[PDB]
């Protein structure tokens, strides 16, 4: 079966689209080479189209069969609720797509309008009708980059697929309990989601270091959710049904899977028919939930097929990788193959040959990689990092055009311990919050396919608790990092990393001088700008903070709001 099929209307957009980034003196502080930077548009949609339609086939085993019989064992132990319908409507992120039924986030959120009804009545008939597939809207997603001439030409947009808001929040009604209990219960540490960064890191130090011998891979999926076959998708079904649920659950996500999730109909932003979907809908609750699970049982299964030696995995997603004993050079790059041959059977051909590594920093996941630093007293510390070229692009698209997402903020509160977190992103924000006379202000923002609202007052604190006090004492950066950070910046036209410093020892002394919550920000946030370095006391605050709703796996398109 074709991943979609096309009716030849084009794939619309649903506002007006800048492809470049606008000169402005407040981005143009962050960087100067503004023609770098580009936004996807709706013009480079085909493009992606026929990258994502192809033929799958697909043919399974022993190996699949016994893992996916565990995994169904597993889930028999879940016991999972329906979510009330106010309690699906507070997960609604406030910039959700609207409603074609005259309603959008802000109605969901508040329980007014016609919201409310019209949940009731999509509900009722999710309950009455498990045949007739749901439309979605088929879109090109308008995301930020730095061109690569290297990796040649722009990337043409990625494309979403969603149903409309009604059905979004009943999804929320039927699925969302088994999101945040049966990932755990079926791959138990292998499942990304429940990391933080920090503990991401723990886990992929604890795998390598039991090794006597590590050998580790990522492996690239080429576009998996074209890849998620039907009877993957009822096979999911099949796995949730596992767990114990009441009946009106059941035929919820049986509806669900049959009307949506397996395939339907798409149309484009003018309502033109556009296509048929038969693969994994990108846009739904169970994007992210069900690659993880997909993932990790073609992985398993592959495994076993290949005969790789103890394999300890990190799944997010379809987002994959496997640690395990080497077997050797050549024993290992045959067995890679092995397991690539089991997944292409089971319909999760590879992008990207996987490459076996040798060295756990060179394993990327979820396009991070481990690095170390020291921290006071001299103890190394280890943390995640990544190539700072995209976030910064975007945070130079987000200076001057205000996102409802602001991805510079997950950035730093993902990446806070980092160099280029540290010295540019920390330092152009607090100053352009300064500038806008905004800082006590709560922003939404994207992480792990979530999106959470955070008050940039609150850094402080939320940086303590997520990656430790270290995280502001951090010095002597790998040569790897200092290399990295500055060819980003220079490539990019930004100032260099001592012209940083500069500048964040006068957004420091700035914070400072308004007292209160801001003072904290500048004696934690730029203790490293200063000579004289104050002694940073662990905050109250930070013990204070409920973080228990952060890392969980999360929603297609991150269609999910946690407040």
């Given at each position: 079966s074709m991943s979609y099929s096309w009716t030849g209307a084009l794939i619309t957009p649903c506002s007006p689209e800048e492809e470049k980034l606008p000169i402005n003196p407040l981005s143009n502080s962050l960087?100067?080479?503004?023609?770098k930077v580009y936004c996807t548009t709706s013009k480079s949609a085909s493009q992606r189209a026929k990258k994502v339609t192809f033929d799958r086939t697909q043919v399974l085993d022993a190996h699949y069969d016994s893992v996916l019989k565990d995994i169904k064992l597993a889930a028999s132990k879940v016991s999972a609720r329906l979510l009330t319908l106010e309690e699906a409507c507070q997960l609604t992120?406030?910039?959700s797509a609207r409603s074609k039924?005259?309603?959008?986030a802000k109605e969901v959120r508040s329980l007014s309008g016609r919201a409310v009804n019209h949940i009731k009545s999509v509900w009722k008939d999710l309950l009455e009708d498990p045949q007739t597939p749901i439309p979605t809207t088929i879109m090109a997603k308008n995301e930020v980059f730095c061109v690569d001439p290297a990796k040649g030409g722009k990337k043409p947009a990625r494309l979403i697929v969603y149903p409309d808001l009604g059905v979004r929040v009943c999804e929320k009604m039927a699925l969302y309990d088994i999101t945040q209990k049966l990932p755990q219960a079926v791959m138990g540490a292998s499942y990304?989601?429940?990391?933080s960064p920090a503990q991401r890191v723990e886990y992929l130090l604890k795998a390598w270091a039991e090794k006597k011998d590590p050998m580790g891979f990522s492996y690239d999926t080429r576009c998996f959710d074209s890849t998620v076959t039907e009877r993957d998708i009822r096979t999911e079904e099949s796995i949730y049904q596992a767990c114990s649920l009441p009946e009106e659950a059941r035929t919820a996500i049986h509806s669900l899977t049959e009307r949506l999730y397996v395939g339907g109909p798409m149309f484009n932003s003018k309502g033109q028919t556009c296509g048929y979907r038969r693969?994994?809908?990108?846009?739904?609750?169970?994007?992210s939930m069900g690659n993880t699970i997909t993932c990790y049982v073609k992985a398993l299964a592959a495994c076993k097929a290949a005969g790789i030696v103890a394999p300890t995995m990190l799944v997010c997603g379809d987002d994959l990788v496997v640690i395990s004993e080497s077997q050797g050079t050549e024993e290992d790059e045959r067995n890679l193959r092995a397991f690539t041959e089991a997944m292409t059977r089971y319909s999760?051909?590879?992008?990207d040959p996987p490459r076996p590594e040798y060295?756990?920093?060179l394993i990327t996941s979820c396009s991070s990689n481990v690095s170390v630093a020291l921290g006071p007293r001299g103890r190394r510390r280890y943390y995640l990092t990544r190539d700072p070229t995209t976030p910064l692009a975007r945070a130079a698209w987000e200076t001057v055009r205000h996102s409802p997402i602001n991805s510079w903020l997950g950035n730093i509160i993902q990446y806070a311990p980092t160099i280029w977190v540290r010295m540019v992103l920390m330092t152009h924000f607090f100053s352009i919050l300064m500038v806008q006379d905004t800082l006590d202000q709560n922003l939404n923002f994207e992480m792990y396919g979530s999106v959470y609202s955070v008050n940039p007052l609150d850094l402080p604190a939320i940086i303590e608790r997520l990656h430790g006090l270290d995280a502001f004492s951090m010095?002597?950066?790998?040569h790897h990092e200092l290399t990295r950070v500055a060819s980003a910046l220079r490539k990019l036209g930004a100032p260099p990393l001592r012209v940083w410093k500069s500048r964040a020892r006068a957004v420091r002394a700035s914070l400072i001088s308004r007292g209160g919550k801001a003072a904290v920000c500048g004696r934690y946030l730029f203790n490293?700008?200063?000579?004289?370095?104050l002694k940073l006391t662990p905050l109250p605050e930070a013990r204070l903070l409920?973080?228990?709703?952060?890392?969980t796996v999360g929603?297609?398109?991150?269609?999910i709001f946690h407040s």
């Open positions: 960087l100067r080479y503004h023609n992120p406030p910039h039924y005259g309603f959008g990304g989601f429940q990391y693969c994994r809908a990108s846009g739904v609750l169970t994007t999760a051909p590879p992008g060295d756990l920093e010095h002597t950066y790998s490293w700008a200063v000579k004289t370095k409920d973080l228990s709703s952060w890392f929603a297609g398109g991150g269609d």
